Structure formats: structure tokens, C-alpha cells
Amino acid sequence: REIVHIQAGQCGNQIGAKFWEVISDEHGIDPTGSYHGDSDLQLERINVYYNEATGNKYVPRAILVDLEPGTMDSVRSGPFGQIFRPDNFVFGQSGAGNNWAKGHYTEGAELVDSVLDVVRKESESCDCLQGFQLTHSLGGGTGSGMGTLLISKIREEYPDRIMNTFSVMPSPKVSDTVVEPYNATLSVHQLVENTDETYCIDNEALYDICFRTLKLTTPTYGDLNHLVSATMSGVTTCLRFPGQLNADLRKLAVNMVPFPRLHFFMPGFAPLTSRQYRALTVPELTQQMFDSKNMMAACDPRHGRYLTVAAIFRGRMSMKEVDEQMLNVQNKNSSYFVEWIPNNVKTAVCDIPPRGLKMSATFIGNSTAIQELFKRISEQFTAMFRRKAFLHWYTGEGMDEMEFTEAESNMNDLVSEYQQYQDA
Amino acid sequence: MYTFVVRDENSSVYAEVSRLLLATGQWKRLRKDNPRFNLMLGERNRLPFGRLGHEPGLVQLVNYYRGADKLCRKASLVKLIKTSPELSESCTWFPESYVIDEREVFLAAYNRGNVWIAKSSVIQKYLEKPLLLEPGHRKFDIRSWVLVDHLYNIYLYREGVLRTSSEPYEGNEMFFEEFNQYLMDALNTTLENSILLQIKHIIRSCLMCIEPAISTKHLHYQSFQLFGFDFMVDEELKVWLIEVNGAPACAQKLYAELCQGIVDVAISSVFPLASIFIKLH
Amino acid sequence: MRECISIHVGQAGVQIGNACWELYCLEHGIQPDGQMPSDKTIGGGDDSFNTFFSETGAGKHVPRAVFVDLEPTVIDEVRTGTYRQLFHPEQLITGKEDAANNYARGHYTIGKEIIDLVLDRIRKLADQCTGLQGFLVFHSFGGGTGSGFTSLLMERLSVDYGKKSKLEFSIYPAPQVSTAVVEPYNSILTTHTTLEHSDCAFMVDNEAIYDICRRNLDIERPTYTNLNRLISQIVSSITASLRFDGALNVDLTEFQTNLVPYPRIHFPLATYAPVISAEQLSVAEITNACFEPANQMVKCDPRHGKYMACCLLYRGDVVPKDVNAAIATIKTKRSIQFVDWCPTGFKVGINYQPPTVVPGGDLAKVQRAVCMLSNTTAIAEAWARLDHKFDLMYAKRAFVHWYVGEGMEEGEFSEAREDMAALEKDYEEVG
Amino acid sequence: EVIELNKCTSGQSFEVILKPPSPSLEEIQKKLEAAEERRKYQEAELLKHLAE
Numbered sequence A: 001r002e003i004v005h006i007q008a009g010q011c012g013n014q015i016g017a018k019f020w021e022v023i024s025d026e027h028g029i030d031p032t033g034s035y036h037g038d039s040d041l042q043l044e045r046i047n048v049y050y051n052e053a054t055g056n057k058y059v060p061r062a063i064l065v066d067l068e069p070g071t072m073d074s075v076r077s078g079p080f081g082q083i084f085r086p087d088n089f090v091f092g093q094s095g096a097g098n099n100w101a102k103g104h105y106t107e108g109a110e111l112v113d114s115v116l117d118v119v120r121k122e123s124e125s126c127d128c129l130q131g132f133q134l135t136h137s138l139g140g141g142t143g144s145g146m147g148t149l150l151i152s153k154i155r156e157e158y159p160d161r162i163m164n165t166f167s168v169m170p171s172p173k174v175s176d177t178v179v180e181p182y183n184a185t186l187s188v189h190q191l192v193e194n195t196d197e198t199y200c201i202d203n204e205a206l207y208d209i210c211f212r213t214l215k216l217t218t219p220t221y222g223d224l225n226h227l228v229s230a231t232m233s234g235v236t237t238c239l240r241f242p243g244q245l246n247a248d249l250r251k252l253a254v255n256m257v258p259f260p261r262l263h264f265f266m267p268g269f270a271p272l273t274s275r276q277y278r279a280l281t282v283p284e285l286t287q288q289m290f291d292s293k294n295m296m297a298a299c300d301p302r303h304g305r306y307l308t309v310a311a312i313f314r315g316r317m318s319m320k321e322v323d324e325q326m327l328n329v330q331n332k333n334s335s336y337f338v339e340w341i342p343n344n345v346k347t348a349v350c351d352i353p354p355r356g357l358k359m360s361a362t363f364i365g366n367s368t369a370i371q372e373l374f375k376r377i378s379e380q381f382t383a384m385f386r387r388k389a390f391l392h393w394y395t396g397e398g399m400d401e402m403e404f405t406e407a408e409s410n411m412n413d414l415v416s417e418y419q420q421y422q423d424a
Numbered sequence B: 001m002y003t004f005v006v007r008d009e010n011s012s013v014y015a016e017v018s019r020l021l022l023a024t025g026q027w028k029r030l031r032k033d034n035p036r037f038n039l040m041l042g043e044r045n046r047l048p049f050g051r052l053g054h055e056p057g058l059v060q061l062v063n064y065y066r067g068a069d070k071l072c073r074k075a076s077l078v079k080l081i082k083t084s085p086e087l088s089e090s091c092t093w094f095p096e097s098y099v100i101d102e103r104e105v106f107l108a109a110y111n112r113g114n115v116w117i118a119k120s121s122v123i124q125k126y127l128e129k130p131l132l133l134e135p136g137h138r139k140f141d142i143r144s145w146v147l148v149d150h151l152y153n154i155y156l157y158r159e160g161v162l163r164t165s166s167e168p169y170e171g172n173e174m175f176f177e178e179f180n181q182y183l184m185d186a187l188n189t190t191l192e193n194s195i196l197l198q199i200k201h202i203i204r205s206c207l208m209c210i211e212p213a214i215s216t217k218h219l220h221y222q223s224f225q226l227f228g229f230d231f232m233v234d235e236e237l238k239v240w241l242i243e244v245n246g247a248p249a250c251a252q253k254l255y256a257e258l259c260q261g262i263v264d265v266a267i268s269s270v271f272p273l274a275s276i277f278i279k280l281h
Numbered sequence C: 001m002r003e004c005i006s007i008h009v010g011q012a013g014v015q016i017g018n019a020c021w022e023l024y025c026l027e028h029g030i031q032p033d034g035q036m037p038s039d040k041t042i043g044g045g046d047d048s049f050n051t052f053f054s055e056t057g058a059g060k061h062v063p064r065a066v067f068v069d070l071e072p073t074v075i076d077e078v079r080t081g082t083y084r085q086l087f088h089p090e091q092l093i094t095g096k097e098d099a100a101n102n103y104a105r106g107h108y109t110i111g112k113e114i115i116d117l118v119l120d121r122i123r124k125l126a127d128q129c130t131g132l133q134g135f136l137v138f139h140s141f142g143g144g145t146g147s148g149f150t151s152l153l154m155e156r157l158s159v160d161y162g163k164k165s166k167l168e169f170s171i172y173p174a175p176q177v178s179t180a181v182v183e184p185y186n187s188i189l190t191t192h193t194t195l196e197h198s199d200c201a202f203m204v205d206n207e208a209i210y211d212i213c214r215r216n217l218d219i220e221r222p223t224y225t226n227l228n229r230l231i232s233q234i235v236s237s238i239t240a241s242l243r244f245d246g247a248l249n250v251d252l253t254e255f256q257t258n259l260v261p262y263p264r265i266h267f268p269l270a271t272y273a274p275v276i277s278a279e280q281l282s283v284a285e286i287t288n289a290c291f292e293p294a295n296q297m298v299k300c301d302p303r304h305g306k307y308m309a310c311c312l313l314y315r316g317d318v319v320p321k322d323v324n325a326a327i328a329t330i331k332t333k334r335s336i337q338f339v340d341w342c343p344t345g346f347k348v349g350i351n352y353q354p355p356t357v358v359p360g361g362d363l364a365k366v367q368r369a370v371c372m373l374s375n376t377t378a379i380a381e382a383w384a385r386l387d388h389k390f391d392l393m394y395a396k397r398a399f400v401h402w403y404v405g406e407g408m409e410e411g412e413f414s415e416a417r418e419d420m421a422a423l424e425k426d427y428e429e430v431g
Numbered sequence D: 001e002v003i004e005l006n007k008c009t010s011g012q013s014f015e016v017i018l019k020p021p022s023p024s025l026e027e028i029q030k031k032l033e034a035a036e037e038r039r040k041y042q043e044a045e046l047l048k049h050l051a052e
């Protein structure tokens, strides 16, 4: 069934653009929307992400949103820029100044109805709309503030559809402005209420992985986004290729989210190799896939417990050996899985590996250690908010101090709800 | 690494087995209610056998045989011996017994020395002519420890113990070395000839009787169990079975040896890492 | 001649159903285009096979079946399969979006909007029956449709066909072929709601089928196709009395009479032998194998239970003398205790036609096979395993909000669980 | 002991004894409607919350 993709703001559009480059390649779609591939497995489930236009061209079901044109100008001249439907570029000129209030209440409010018009036009051409996936950062203004405004109005109009996000969390180690913790705290509460599943992508982890593992002195945003697009391809494999499961966004949410607010997932990927031709056996994939160094949220999973886990293996390998190694991780670290959700790990396989690799593995964990991420942001928020530092940027857009107090509380409630189940 | 759970902290025996396991460095103790174990040291009552053998990728073993209670309950032991043609009412090594139903068959025999004992966790003959130790002129019983592994091998621990009386008729425990020397000095015979041949015969008889009902040969989980057999000896050096205990303790002097023997024979045989028994059959 | 209507619900029900009708066609000599050269009466008949197949004036033999699923992709394989020519559109019913592994979505939300349609399409099959016996209902316990919509359908059928029998073929969940983490919730909810509406139900644990496939067929990673071809042999063994000349289990009523004295305890254990990968076993040996847990459809230990009824169903070169001899031996070797209020015996049926196997499949064709149906209290071990998994999750209310979000009340959970606690209790009062 | 031996061309059946013994339509529609109403209620609360 069909998914409608939305990418909002600078980060959202840059990782969204690479996502469409990656999966277009996997499905054999060239930058002009025409298919060239040797396997029909590439086309069995291609309508999930692509519309079939006049002729036999495939068009991403993607909407590109921003409050300034800069980043979307470069998308349009990007490698696969011309594949997107020109009507689906929706932008203003003001920008949002790294300011959640501008994205959510002033500048973003002026543009959002036009975005919803395009969403509506895409949903109407869907035989069976599954729901939406949004790519955005939480530290800026457009992705965070206007992105969360968008999901709220999408929920009001399509309350019975699934809302999924890939949300990039800010880190002082990879920072543009000091107000990022304010913007991220405001956004998380929106996500708590109005998404069904959120992949938490921490720029802290992406940097550490580039620096420590891939041995990249001086990572760039481009290098960060290579990790992200590889992860995004991994976690959407079951949506895009046939399996024993008839995979979809709602079944994933039912099986991953035991309590409605705890829907923030730690993603992981293996292998992560510095530029390589070396074969990786199934045991090696499995240990690396579960290793903290391969996690994208900068949370130590040993500091908490797994509520649920989904794992996807890609390539030619023994499925018996996959089950053996997966069962071996559960039986030999059973403490780190909660005992009150029996058999909480599901494994999927897909014989088609991603570009450049013979074998790969993708990890999706609902772990209580994610509370460390929210606690880190809460600490950074409070360090400034107790001195009301930088608040005039927000009160100038009509926001009140009370709304910051309420987001701080909501955040700390979320942390405590995770700690509630980490001891159980 | 192998995993095990402990569900009977009152177990003197398996408190020592778990100590030895942990001290191997190759066994990890889990929380009791964790289902991803290799080995269950289960509870004495209502052990959930129906939940074993359903964990993919785990060979699962438990230290009790489901159904062995028929042998280890005084009432049903009598029923088992009388109603099993393998054993039958006419076996020479079990006293005449009756449960209470069987009131009316009892009296048919009592009518005719008629000293009887009555017990219940049901009524049988009291052995009027026990073999009496000297000096002291005193009564005793013999405890034998038997280990049955997952292949239904029957292992008789080479060390038994006598539970002696202080009163006419150390620690009221005499071990086989001394009792053997006494039988040689007093009655010019050996423990092996006059007694153990009978003990081995009874152990084999009782355990081969129930083997079809409790064996885990073709089953999805495996069992072993430690049994304590209790014997009486009469003046003619005839051995009598009194009781079979399914949850026995051990003599402090023999915990080290026996509990180690359990690990080697019953546990490590299934979960091998990187004798003191006599095998009966 | 009295007709039987088969109803297949959800992916598991549909795929197992497709495999059974394939096997039926092979057993009866019905080609994929529905023709049957051996059937010399055209356009009608009250032969035994007409209990499952109606006939057209053109000579097509049409299964008396309805396939229903809340998404179209599984049933879309039936209408394009090698046997697509057998069924007509009215028989294949698909919805838009599935129950998302959620009993409450399958029972309440989506089930409400498709139930009247399903009943109409069943009504159409019922109208063509001179004397309908009742229904055979195939479904999983663990899916949202197989659990949620089946329980709704069983309720309406008891209303609309009050005097008719209903039998179930139910797939009990196993994590080695798992679809959803909430399958224990769905299994118990649907058992609670279906219990008073089902006269006899044959449970198959995917764990058992998986292991038999690995062990006796040397299949390393069994698929649903491996599993279903084995399951369809067993289903075929159970329904053969309805489709062939015979005197044992000749109508649905007789299943209840012979296997279920106590109506709540209506879950017979099936055991099948021999399963051989593509030396010939004797009557004594395949019968002996009916008392090995490794060949049972649900792993459990019947030595630690009591029998209420036992049926032996032989296919192939079997004569009553060899069965009696085999039974003599087994009885004096194995622990077989009946309840005191039942006779200690066996009903035996022999069909001389040996089992049919799908050409190219994984099952070797044999000269004799047997399916034993025994109502033993030991099957309760499967209820206890499941109720325990339910309890672990429900103590924290994990995942409950998904069901309450569909309009179900939290109290239905503990209502259904208390029923299962009474069921486990009734089984223990017998032992 | 063997009893009830029936013989036909396709097979035979018999019994071996080794030892003698010693809600209406309206009600359903009610539960379904109740669930749908609870569903509609939860939904109006969400749209009230989003209107705020």
C-alpha cells in the first residue's frame, strides 16, 4: 500500500534527497524515472514509494518543503533532482532562522495549507494509503517547528493513517546554533503525541561513527548523510521488497510499541567499513549489528533494556544460520531483553543486498536506554532556560515562557516513563 | 556459555551444584522466571514440565523426572509394587503393605507376631528382627544415593551411609568402610556380598519398572534426577526396601564428591565444558 | 448425502485451504479445470465426494468453499493459481486493509463492515445444499483476521445455522514462524469468544510441524509451503471419511459423538505417521509411532494425562487383523490410561486408497499411513504455555492500547483469560 | 473384543474395546455498536484536542 513521503527544512531535504538516490538505485530507477534492472523483485512493491506516471515512468511520491529555496534549489539540480514532480516543491522565501516558533506559529503557518494541498493530491491517487514518513531535523526551525505543525494537521485530516518520522537530534558536537535544545525539546512533545514511530538519528552518534570507525578526520554533513541514507534503506527494506511477512507501517507499530508514547527507536547498521571487499560471515553481521558502536542514537543499550527489536538481513546467506545467530544473541544476553514481552525479536531477510555490499544488517530497537538521549537534551535545555537565555527570539514570535515550562515538564515525564520500565 | 535457573533455594544438594556450576566460569545463573535457560534446578512441587522444550535454539534439561512421584509417595509406591506385574504383590524385598482403600484386605492377614507400623506423607509390617550393631545392640537403616541421567543410565553412588540408633532395641552416621569391616569381623562376610547385591537388585527393579512412564528418550526436553533409597537389613542379612525419596539431602562429608559427580554425569554429559558411581544394568 | 461447506479465513486459513483442495483434487481425480473423467454422472449426484464438490451442467466440480481475507494479496494467489478454474468470484472475498495482527480490528472495526457480505456468499452456497451438515473453518489463532474475524463469523453462523455443526482447523502460534508479538493475546481472545460456538477443533502447533519438517524431511528452514503440504495430508486424513464410502465419521455430528464427551473440552490431539522424505513401515510400527510425542501435531506428553476417546484412521494396505495385533502390543508397553467414565478402546477406520502426495513435493508416497485422533487432557499443556505468555504481557498491559483503540474494552481481556483459567481447570478435574 | 465391523469396497471400519469403564442477532449487534461508539468517542476527543 502507498506511502506519502515528506521532507522539510535543510536537513530533511538533504537526507531525503540521498534516500531517494539510494532506493532509486536499488529499484533500478535512473535519474529520469525510467527503469533499468535485471530482477522483477525490484518492481513487485515499487508502488509503495513511486507513482507510475504517463508512459512507464516512476515518480517518487515525495513532497519537498522548506521556508527558503536554497536547499531545494540544489536538490533540483542534484543528481536525481529531475525525478521529483515539480508541483511537489513547496517553498517560501522568509526562512525560519533556526527558530521553532517561526516554523510552527508564524512563517510556517503561512505556507502549511499549500503543503496540505499537495499531500491531499497525492493521497487521493492512492489505492490504499498506508500513511506518511517525514524526514527532518529537530534542532532548526523549518524541519522542527513547521515539520511538527505539518504532522499535527495531517493527523487532523488523516487520523486513521500511520505517521512515521526520521528525526535528526541535535548535538553540541555537531551544532549550528545554541538554541537547538530549545527547538528539539519543543518538537519532541509534538512527536510524543502525533507520531506512531520515530527513528531517532543522533548527530552525536553519526559523528562518532564517521570519526572513530570510518576513520574520518573532519566529518562533513555529507559523510553524516551517507550513514543516514544507508540506515533509511535498511529500515524500509521490508516495505520495498517481498518477504515471508506482508510488512507495513501499522504492523510494525503494533509489534514495536507496547505503550503509545514509547515509540522512539534506536536504529543500527552493519557493516560500517572504511574505504571493504572483505566477506562478512553471518556471525560477524550479528555481533556488529548489536554493537553500541553501530547504533545511531548515542545511547548505551546496556544502560537499559530492549522492549522490542526488529532486524533485517540483506544478501545471500543461510537463513538457518541467521536464526541460529539471532537466537544466540537473545539466549546469551537475555537480561537485556525485558522478560514480560516474550519473543520480542523478529528477523526478516531479503536476498537483494544494498549497493556496494554482499551482506548487510539493519537493527531497529525499542530500548529504554533512549532515555539518555532525552535526558541529554533536557539538561542542555535547562542550562539555558533557568537564565531565560536566548528566549527573546521566541517571545518575539508571540510565544510565552509557560509553553517552554510545559515542554520541559513533558520531556521529563517521558524520561521517567522510560525509567519506569527499565527497572520492571 | 550455558545458562541455568534455581527454583529451590532450600535444596541443600543443588545449592552446592549451582556453586560448582558458577565456579566453572562457563555457567551463568539467570533469574528464576527467565525462560531462556539450558538447565532448570526446579521446585519440589508443581514444576511446570509443560513449559519445557519449547524454546527454539535451547537444549533444555531439568533435575526431576516427571512422574517419578509414583515411586516416591508411600501410598502410590505400595500401589505401584502390587499392581505392576514387573514387581507384583509377590516380590521378596518389600514388606506386606496396605493403603487406607484397602481396610478389609489388611484384616484378612492381621487375624493370625503381628507388629505393624503406620505412616503417611499406608500400613505395612514392622520388621521385628532387625540386624543389630554391636557393641550397642542397636538398629540402623541404609541410605543409598542413585543418579538417573537423561539416557536412563542408573548410577549408584559408591558411598552410602547408615543412620544408626544410639539406644538399645558418631553423629549416628556410619559409612561403608567401617560397616564393611564390622561385617568382616563380626559375621565373616562383606558389604558387597551380604547386602549390596540386594540393594543394586532393588534399585534396578524399581527404576526399570517406571522407565516407560517417565523416560525422556524421545521427548522435547530431557530429565535427570537424584534419588535417595532407604533400606532395612534383617538378622539373616536380607535387605528390605522402606522408602524412595525424590528430594534427598546428603551427608556433609559426601556433598563435595556427590554434587561434583552430578555435574560430571548428569549435567556436563549434556552441556560439556572445554568414577565414584557404579553403573547398573 | 449431506453437504459440508469449508471456510478459510486469513492468510493461514487461505493458504492451508488452497493446499487441501489441491490434495482433494488429486485424491478424487479432478483435474485443475474442474473436470472429473471418472464421474460418469454429469451435472449432479449424491456420491460421497459431492459432500465437498458441487457440479455444473458442463461437468465442472466446484469446491463448496469460501475464502475470506481482509487484504487481497493471499487470495489473489488462488484466483491465479493452477486451480483458479475451480472457483467462481463469489467464493473469494477480499477486503481493503488487513487487521494489522489485532484481534479487535478484525472482530470489531473491520469485521463489522464485511460480515454481512461473507454471510451472503455463504448463504448462496447453503442454498444449493439438499441437507447441509455444517461448516469446516480454517484459520490461525495469531493473526488479526484469523482470530478476530473468525470469532465474529462463528457467532453469526450459530445464529443463522443453529442446528448445524462447526469444526475448526486452527493454527496455534510458534515463535519460530512468528508473525506478531501479540499472538498470545489474539489466541486467547478468539478461543474465549469461539469456545461455545465450536463442536470440535483440531489444533496444529506450527512448532510441531516445523520440527517434523526439519527432522523427517531434512528441510533446514521450512517454509509455509512445506508446512501446509504436511498439514493438508493430516486434514485430508480427518476429512476422508466425509468424502469416501465408509461407516466411521460419516457426518460432522459423528466427530462430536466419537471424540468429545464433555463439550468444552473439544480439542482432539492429532498424531500422524509415517512422514518420510522423497524402507516401508508396518502396521505395528506406524501405530506405535502414534504414541511418540515427536509425531504429534502439538508437542505434549500423553503419558501424563487421561484419554476420553481415541480414533485410528488408516490409509493404504491395512487389514483389521494387523491393527488388532499392533494394538495388543502397544497396550502392554505404553502408558495409556482412560478416564474411569469412558471405555478403554479404539474406533478404527481403514480406507484402502493409500495417501496421495503432491508430485514433486517433499513427502514420499507410502503404502500405509495412519492419523490418530485422541482426546487427551495432555493437550492442556498447550493452553498453559499460552496463558502464561498472556499473563507476562498483560500484567504490564503491554500493547493493550492497540485493542482499546479499536473499541474493545480492557475487561474483555480478563474475561477471556478467566475463561481459559476455567478451561485449564476443567482439564485438571479430569486427571 | 471387536464390534461394529462394516465392510465396503473402499475400506472397512470397526471398534476395539480393551476394558469396560469403571446470543441472538440483536445481542451481537449491540456489542459491535457499543465498540463503534467508544471508537467514535475517542476520535471526537482527539479532534477536540486538535481544535484546542
Ligand SMILES: Nc1nc2c(ncn2[C@@H]2O[C@H](COP(=O)(O)OP(=O)(O)OP(=O)(O)O)[C@@H](O)[C@H]2O)c(=O)[nH]1
Binding pocket: C009, C010, C011, C012, C013, C015, C016, C069, C070, C098, C099, C100, C101, C102, C106, C139, C140, C141, C142, C143, C144, C145, C146, C147, C171, C172, C173, C174, C177, C178, C179, C180, C183, C206, C224, C227, C228, C231
Ligand atoms: N501453518 C501455517 N501457518 C501460517 C501460514 N500463514 C500464516 N501462518 C501463521 O499464522 C499466524 C499469523 O496469522 P495470519 O493468518 O498470517 O494473519 P491473518 O489471519 O491474515 O490476519 P491479519 O493480521 O489481518 O494479517 C502466525 O502464527 C503464522 O505463523 C501458513 O500458510 N501456514
Ligand SMILES: Nc1ncnc2c1ncn2[C@@H]1O[C@H](COP(=O)(O)OP(=O)(O)CP(=O)(O)O)[C@@H](O)[C@H]1O
Binding pocket: B095, B117, B119, B124, B125, B126, B127, B139, B140, B141, B163, B230, B232, B242, B243, B245
Ligand atoms: N517397616 C519398618 N521396619 C523397621 N523400621 C522401619 C519401618 N518403617 C520405618 N522404619 C524406621 O523409620 C525410619 C524412617 O521412617 P520412614 O522412612 O518411613 O520415614 P521418612 O520419610 O521420614 C525417611 P527419610 O528421613 O529418609 O526421608 C527408619 O530409620 C526406620 O528404621
Ligand SMILES: Nc1nc2c(ncn2[C@@H]2O[C@H](COP(=O)(O)OP(=O)(O)O)[C@@H](O)[C@H]2O)c(=O)[nH]1
Binding pocket: A008, A009, A010, A011, A012, A014, A015, A096, A097, A098, A099, A137, A138, A139, A140, A141, A142, A143, A144, A168, A169, A170, A171, A174, A175, A176, A180, A203, A206, A221, A222, A224, A225, A228
Ligand atoms: N545529519 C545532518 N544534520 C543536519 C544537516 N543539516 C542540518 N543538520 C542539523 O540540523 C539542525 C539544523 O536544522 P536545519 O535542518 O538546518 O534547519 P531548518 O532548515 O530550519 O530545518 C542541526 O542540529 C544540524 O546539525 C544535514 O545535512 N545532515
Ligand SMILES: COc1cc(C(=O)N/N=C/c2cccc3ccccc23)cc(OC)c1OC
Binding pocket: A235, A236, A237, A238, A239, A245, A246, A247, A248, A249, A251, A252, A255, A256, A308, A309, A310, A311, A312, A343, A344, A345, A346, A347, A348, A364, C178, C179, C180, C181
Ligand atoms: C522485521 O522488520 C519489519 C517487520 C514489519 C512487520 O510487518 N511486522 N513486524 C513485526 C515485529 C517487529 C518487531 C518485533 C516483533 C517480534 C515478534 C514478532 C513480530 C515483531 C514491518 C517492517 O517494515 C515496516 C519491518 O521492517 C523494519
Ligand SMILES: [Ca+2]
Binding pocket: C039, C040, C041, C042, C043, C044, C045, C055
Ligand atoms: Ca456426478
Ligand SMILES: [Mg+2]
Binding pocket: A010, A011, A140, A176
Ligand atoms: Mg541549517
Ligand SMILES: [Mg+2]
Binding pocket: B243, B245
Ligand atoms: Mg521421606
Ligand SMILES: [Mg+2]
Binding pocket: C010, C011, C071, C098, C143, C145
Ligand atoms: Mg493477513
